[PDB]
């Protein structure tokens, strides 16, 4: 998202968060959602415009900005965005900061890229939120990408693998509660950002007394390494997940892929010949729990004596 401060008082010390959009830029403007008053004499009535384009799918990817349009509304000395005056027809930008000069103004109104990208769990939370989202200029997703700041899950019964995926890469996890607030929140941040919407907040209200949750996802990294394990096709995130927890993953595909090379080379299967066979979400139960090495040994031994 796009925030623009200030230094002096120009902008009363606030941060605003220009959310897509457009903007009336100017000393003789009362702030609201489409206004921003900037508190200068030597400033027009009506400065300038800032446009606010809706984010592309490749912002989702790159990180990258909303498009930020700037026009120069008539004045005597012209709108400067990044010491080039602003032409006619108007400048537009998807470099992620701009220092903005509005006529004989010597405090520039700086405008930075914060970004936020969220990822969602599920196609059909994803189709919920998805133009609330973009006109709120958050890429949004279903793929895995670099840019990625924050994750919707889906809350129920069992949590998802893409949810135990986004916890242990140290990810802010988030509800649609999150989603709701900042709809209900937005004209507020616009006139003051500080009153975005903190999402680690949220993020530490759902861990918090949460069974499908543990305590740290710092202390689940590398917590099953020097282990073995074959698994399905099922989840490139799941084969993702598997390998945090510091798992040998081995890759089978039908009933009789497992020889007697797998046997030796494997401790258990993941799923969903008399072995040792576990769910992915079994196995999140197992790492909830404070002893996961010596649960999973005492089953692997204790199998061996049936066999």
């Given at each position: 998202?796009?925030i ?5 008082d ?5 941060s605003?968060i220009?959310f ?17 008053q ?13 446009t ?8 989702y990817?790159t990180g ?13 000395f012209?709108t400067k965005v ?8 108007g ?5 992620k900061?701009?220092k ?7 405090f ?12 969602f769990?599920?196609?059909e ?5 998805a133009?609330?989202?973009?006109l709120?200029?958050i ?13 919707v ?24 509660s999150?989603?709701q ?9 616009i006139?003051?950002?500080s ?6 907040e ?16 710092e202390?689940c990294?590398?917590?099953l390494?020097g282990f ?10 799941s ?8 798992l ?14 797998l ?14 066979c576990?769910?992915?979400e079994?196995?999140?139960?197992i790492?909830i ?15 061996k004596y049936?066999?």
């Amino acid at each position: 998202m796009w925030i623009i401060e200030a230094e002096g008082d120009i902008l009363k010390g606030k941060s605003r968060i220009l959310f897509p959009g457009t903007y009336i830029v100017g000393r003789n403007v009362s702030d609201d959602s489409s206004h921003i008053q900037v508190i200068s004499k030597s400033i027009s009535k009506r400065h300038a415009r800032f446009t606010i384009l809706t984010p592309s799918e490749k912002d989702y990817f790159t990180g990258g900005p909303c498009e930020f349009e700037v026009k120069d509304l008539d004045t005597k000395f012209g709108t400067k965005v990044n010491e080039k005056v602003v032409g006619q027809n108007g400048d537009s930008y998807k470099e992620k900061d701009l220092k903005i000069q509005l006529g004989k103004c010597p405090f520039t109104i700086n405008a930075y890229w914060r970004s936020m990208c969220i990822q969602f769990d599920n196609p059909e939370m994803l189709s919920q939120w998805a133009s609330n989202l973009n006109l709120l200029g958050i890429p949004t997703g279903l793929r895995d990408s670099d840019a990625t700041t924050h994750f919707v899950m889906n809350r129920g019964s069992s949590i998802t693998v893409g949810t135990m995926y986004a916890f242990l890469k140290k990810t802010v996890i988030i509800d649609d509660s999150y989603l709701q607030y900042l709809s209900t929140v937005k004209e507020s941040v616009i006139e003051d950002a500080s009153l975005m919407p903190d999402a680690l907040e949220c993020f530490k209200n759902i861990i918090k007394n949460n069974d499908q949750f543990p305590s740290s996802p710092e202390d689940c990294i590398n917590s099953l390494e020097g282990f073995s394990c074959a698994m399905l096709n099922t989840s490139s995130e799941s084969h993702h997940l598997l390998e945090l927890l510091g798992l040998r993953i081995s890759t089978f595909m039908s009933l009789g892929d497992i020889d007697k090379e797998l046997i030796s080379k494997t401790d258990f299967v993941v799923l969903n010949e008399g072995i040792f066979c576990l769910t992915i979400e079994q196995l999140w139960k197992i790492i909830i729990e404070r002893n996961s090495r010596e649960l999973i040994s005492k089953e692997i031994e204790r199998l061996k004596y049936a066999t």
